[PDB]
Structures are given as C-alpha cells and as structure tokens.
Structure 1
Amino acid sequence: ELPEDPRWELPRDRLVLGKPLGEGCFGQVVLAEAIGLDKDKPNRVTKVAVKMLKSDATEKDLSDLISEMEMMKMIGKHKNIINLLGACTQDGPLYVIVEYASKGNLREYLQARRPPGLEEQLSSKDLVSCAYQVARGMEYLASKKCIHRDLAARNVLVTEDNVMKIADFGLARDIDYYKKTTNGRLPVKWMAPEALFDRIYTHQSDVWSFGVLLWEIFTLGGSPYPGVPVEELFKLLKEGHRMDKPSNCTNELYMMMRDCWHAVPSQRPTFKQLVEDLDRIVALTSNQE
C-alpha cells in the first residue's frame, strides 16, 4: 500500500491514457492527457508521459518506480531535464506522470534530420545549441548531487519546441557489459574507464559520457566505435585510444571532446566550465551553414 502526497496527487478521472511510447520488460511509458493539471485552468488538457508497471511486476520493480518519483521530487525543476508533473498513487496502479517530448530521443531526432542521400535541417549554431542545453541540464543535476551514470543521446528527449531534456536521471542504482540496446548498441562505449574498470561513477565520469554525446551530435547520431565488440573496446581504452574528429566539427569542439576524455578524471572540464564555453561558442557559431 502507498501513502498520498497532496503536492503531486492527480485524481484518476483527470488522466486519459493513450498509445504506448515505450516498454521494458521493466515497466512501460504511455502518451496521456491530463485534465486541468495546473491550479488554473482546471479545464485545459496537457499531453503528458505516464510511467507505469507491466503485469509481471514485482515488489522490487514497484520500489524502483517509487524511488524514481521520490528522486525527482527532491531534485526539483529545470527547463533542460524531464520534470515531474503529478502522480496517481491511490486506489490503483502507480502512475508517475512526467514531461512529454513529442520529437523522441536526441539520437532518433538527429538521424531523422541528416542531409539527403546518396523538410527540417539543423545549422551549425543549432547543433552547438543542443550541446549547450544538455550541459545546462547536467550542470543543474550536478548542483543537486545527481550522478546520471548513463548520459547518452538516447537518454535526452526533444520537445515540440526543440528543447533538450535529460531523461532517466532518477533510475534505480541496482550491470552486464555484453548487453546491447534496442538499436543494437553497446552502452559500455559511453563509460569512463574508471567507471568501467573500477566501478567509480562521479560527475567526472558523466563528463566523459558528455564527450561521447558531443561526438553523437556533430556526427548527426553516429554510432560510437562501429563493429567494435566489448573485449576489443577495453584494449582501445587501455592503449589511450580516442574517437576520430567528426567532419563538420570545429577544432575547438573536438579539443572539447578530447578534454572530456582526459585520462585523469580531475583534469577533465566540469559541467559548469562546459556550460560557459558552449555559451560563448553558440554566440560565435554561424546559423548560415
């Protein structure tokens, strides 16, 4: 049984469910319509995302979704993170109501806006702006002592207004290195060597992951290290190997990626330094190409 928090509780008759946005088997996300979410108007509908459990859910799977909601309540609001909007915790299945990003993840979005081969296209100032927002989201998360542990283009969602929002920042701590994603990608490729070989996740290991994220932006949703299996990736990290400079990527932004991949975690930039640099770079980057 669950206790009511009146700050966040939404009556169940105010949530009209819809088409599913994602799956697991670890839970499921659906598209929904929340009636009068805001204090005024109680007659306006907001399109939302509803996190819920599957039929084959256990007490562990349930405590995991509670902790996530609980984490989001503590962390607070930012324009560049997926915010918490409400919850249905009484007399039925637990529904954690979060922000809905109509354009999907940042990898899918970037891939769908690639140049023709072989209706909407992003300029140089556009790509750098995506990097700025994600570093803004991550810096707030860092200010609130949150360590993402899986910062990647896949876990950055995009709104109808082209705002970048960090997602799955509140997920349960609980990893199989040989496991691949839905898109058949190995998540170990976003991991800092200290986190991968010593299990030491810090704000510095998330900075490493931001470096893999930039490479994903300026390659327009490119796959890091294609064809490279798990065991061959460890050898690449031990030799001091680094990814190649994307084409249509400045010397300044590649120097940034490489700094993010500094072998020594203490020597890497902070998100507070990355927000500042990208703030300046956007202002100097051309919107004409």
Structure 2
Amino acid sequence: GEAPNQALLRILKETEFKKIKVLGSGAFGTVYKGLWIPEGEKVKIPVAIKELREATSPKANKEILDEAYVMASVDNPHVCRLLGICLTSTVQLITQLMPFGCLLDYVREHKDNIGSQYLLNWCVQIAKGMNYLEDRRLVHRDLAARNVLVKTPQHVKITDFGLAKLLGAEEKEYHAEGGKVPIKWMALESILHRIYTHQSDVWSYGVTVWELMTFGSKPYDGIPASEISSILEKGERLPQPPICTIDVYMIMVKCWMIDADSRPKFRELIIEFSKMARDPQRYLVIQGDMDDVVDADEYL
C-alpha cells in the first residue's frame, strides 16, 4: 500500500499470435486456444486469448482492464500468468494455456482416478497461491474450484481476477458496493456487511476444499441463496465429505468460523495440508488409491 507497483504491462501485436480452436464462449466474449509467437524469438507459447465480447460497452473494457491490471501485478507459480493485452477494437487478454481446463470440471470428469495425493497437493498449491496473494495484499473475493485451472494434473494455478481488490494504504477490509457475488462461497461477514478480508478468502478456501473432497458437489445443493445467511447463523455448515478423515474435515470447519480471526492463515493451511500430503492415505480414505514450443512458465 506504499510500495510502487512496477509490474510491466505488455502490449501485443495481433499478428504475434494465431488462434487455433475456440475453447469456451458466451457471457463475456470468446476464449480461443492459440499460440503466441513473439518477434523473431523462435518460441511459440500456448496461450488462451479472451476477447471483449464484440459490442464494446465502456463498462466491459474497464473490467478486463482491471483484471489485466491485477493479473500483471502477480508473479507466482500458483497464480495464473498474464502474458499481455492486445489493443484491438475488441481488447484481448492473453494468458497461459491451462490445457486440462478448470479443476471443478476435472474432479467431476475424473472421480475414479483422483488419489488422496492429488487432492492434498492441490490443497497445498491453492493455499500457496493465496498466501502469495495475501503477501501482495490482495483479496481475491472469488475463490472456488471453478476458478482454479489445471496446467497439469500435478500443477494447479488460481485464476479469475474479476473481483480481486487490492487493499489501498493499510486497509484491513474491503467495503464493496452492490452487485452479484457467488453467495455459497462467502464468509458470513461478507453476506451481512459486504466486508472482504484475506480471512473471508480463507472461508472460500474451506468451501473450495470441500468442493474438491466431494469430487465436485455443489455446496448447499438444495438450499437457494436467499436462505444461506440464516442457515449459517444457525451455526450450520457443510457435511463431512465421505473420503474425509476428521483431521481434514476439522480444517474445513475452522475456515468456517464466524470469528474471522479464529479461522486459519493460508500460511498455516500450507503447513497443515503439506504435513498430511506426506502420508495421504492416513487422511483421505479413497477406495482404490510442434518443435519450438515453450510453456509460458519458461518464458521470462
């Protein structure tokens, strides 16, 4: 909140990259899979190119730019690497290709093959992304299994900074305005007061971990979002997933304490899951247990 942010924003020529397929699309614009072939560097970087939507509202561009702002000011193995923007009519965000898609889909699609080892490693890896975000005094405000992408089954990275807010000169909490937020992932203090802290991010972590352990269930599957604040005030939380020893579950529960300072610090989460990741089967009981291409992580 006083350190100058000297991250470099890279402006890309539209002709430095070719689109190949079309990955997702819809409510935002279109995401393409493609390659970024800088200058005459002899490298090709698999990328994901997200473009505005077309029909350019001064509303849309102001946001993809905020995101670009945020994404350019982070550099961590567990946070998504933003390559640059391309300033065409329609602004494109260019980021690292996460070939295995997002983690939420990946656990669903692969239930019968996910071992305790992967699950705990993911948990540790996310804990690391977030603890780094906490260092950068950054509040994600939208942590969920949908917003973690899979670069390889053993390497996940946090994504989606369309809510992330950077904490100004020593603020503690962010006092957000109105507007849509995913209710089933939010700390209670967030629902009732729109306060967001690093600790409200812990809460969402707790739910993310619960999405992982139930191989992609939907939290409060039945309950509609309107009831939630009450239900949680009742002192009720999510069920202990089947595969989960009490050790693991106890940690989820801690992330869900009302007294935000009572919940654990990402640095502690790292320690705890990493102790557990040394003996995965003690904590999760799972039945069965082209030529010039370079990954963005090696292009510096």
Task: Give TM-score, length-normalised by structure 2.
Answer: 0.82
In structure 1, what is the equivalent of residue 211 of structure 2? 216
CA offset digits 1:180-237 (Å, max 9, x no partner): xxxxxxx211111100111001001110000001111111111111111123323211
Query: Residue 216 of structure 1 contacts residue 223 of structure 1 at CA under 8 Å; is this kept in 2?
Result: yes
In structure 2, what is the equivalent of residue 67 of structure 1? 66
Match of 1:204 among 196, 199, 202: 199
Deviation at 1:284, TM superposition (A): 2.3
Deviation at 1:9, TM superposition (A): 2.6
Match of 2:108 among 111, 115, 136: 111
In structure 2, what is the equivalent of residue 79 of structure 1? 77
- Judging changes above 3 Å, is the alpha-carbon distance between structure 1 residues 222 and 140 closer, same or farther for their aligned structure 2 residues? same
Instruction: Please give the residue correspondences for 1:188-267 in structure 2 after superposition, counting only pairs within 5 Å.
Output: 188-267=183-262
Deviation at 1:286, TM superposition (A): 3.3
CA offset digits 1:67-89 (Å, max 9, x no partner): 21122222x31111111112323
Deviation at 1:169, TM superposition (A): 2.5
Helix, strand or coil for the counterpart of 1:108? helix
Query: Residue 147 of structure 1 contacts residue 206 of structure 1 at CA under 8 Å; is this kept in 2?
Result: yes
C-alpha distance in structure 1 between counterparts of 2:104 and 2:206, whole Å: 15
RMSD of aligned Cα (Å)? 2.3
C-alpha distance in structure 1 between counterparts of 2:30 and 2:192, whole Å: 31
C-alpha distance in structure 1 between counterparts of 2:265 and 2:26, whole Å: 33
2:267 is aligned with 1:279: no
- Judging changes above 3 Å, is the alpha-carbon distance between structure 1 residues 197 and 111 closer, same or farther for their aligned structure 2 residues? same
Deviation at 1:46, TM superposition (A): 1.6
Task: Tell me the number of residue pairs that the alignment of Structure 1 and Structure 2 aligns.
Answer: 267
CA offset digits 1:56-103 (Å, max 9, x no partner): 2211211111221122222x31111111112323x6432221111111
CA offset digits 1:3-53 (Å, max 9, x no partner): xx986233222110132323353333221111148xxx7222221011211
In structure 2, what is the equivalent of residue 183 of structure 1? none
- Runs of 4+ more than 3 Å apart: 170-177
- Structure 1 gaps of 5+ residues are 116-120, 180-186
Query: Residue 24 of structure 2 contacts residue 30 of structure 2 at CA under 8 Å; is this kept in 1?
Result: yes
Match of 1:133 among 111, 125, 133: 125
| Percent identity over paired residues | 35
2:52 is aligned with 1:48: no
Query: Residue 80 of structure 2 contacts residue 159 of structure 2 at CA under 8 Å; is this kept in 1?
Result: yes
Residue identity opposite 1:12 in structure 2? E
Residue identity opposite 1:26 in structure 2? F
2:97 is aligned with 1:100: yes
Helix, strand or coil for the counterpart of 1:20? coil
C-alpha distance in structure 1 between counterparts of 2:273 and 2:280, whole Å: 10
- Structure 2 gaps of 5+ residues are 1-6, 166-176, 283-287, 290-300
C-alpha distance in structure 2 between counterparts of 1:20 and 1:58, whole Å: 23
In structure 2, what is the equivalent of residue 17 of structure 1? 19
Deviation at 1:176, TM superposition (A): 5.5
C-alpha distance in structure 2 between counterparts of 1:254 and 1:28, whole Å: 38
Helix, strand or coil for the counterpart of 1:157? strand
Helix, strand or coil for the counterpart of 1:248? coil
In structure 1, what is the equivalent of residue 28 of structure 2? 26
Helix, strand or coil for the counterpart of 2:83? strand
Query: Residue 254 of structure 2 contacts residue 263 of structure 2 at CA under 8 Å; is this kept in 1?
Result: yes
C-alpha distance in structure 2 between counterparts of 1:211 and 1:6, whole Å: 33
Query: Residue 77 of structure 2 contacts residue 157 of structure 2 at CA under 8 Å; is this kept in 1?
Result: yes
Query: Residue 140 of structure 2 contacts residue 164 of structure 2 at CA under 8 Å; is this kept in 1?
Result: no
C-alpha distance in structure 2 between counterparts of 1:149 and 1:243, whole Å: 20
C-alpha distance in structure 2 between counterparts of 1:53 and 1:248, whole Å: 41
C-alpha distance in structure 2 between counterparts of 1:25 and 1:207, whole Å: 28
Residue identity opposite 1:103 in structure 2? F
C-alpha distance in structure 2 between counterparts of 1:270 and 1:130, whole Å: 17
Deviation at 1:161, TM superposition (A): 5.1
Residue identity opposite 2:13 in structure 1? P
C-alpha distance in structure 2 between counterparts of 1:133 and 1:249, whole Å: 19
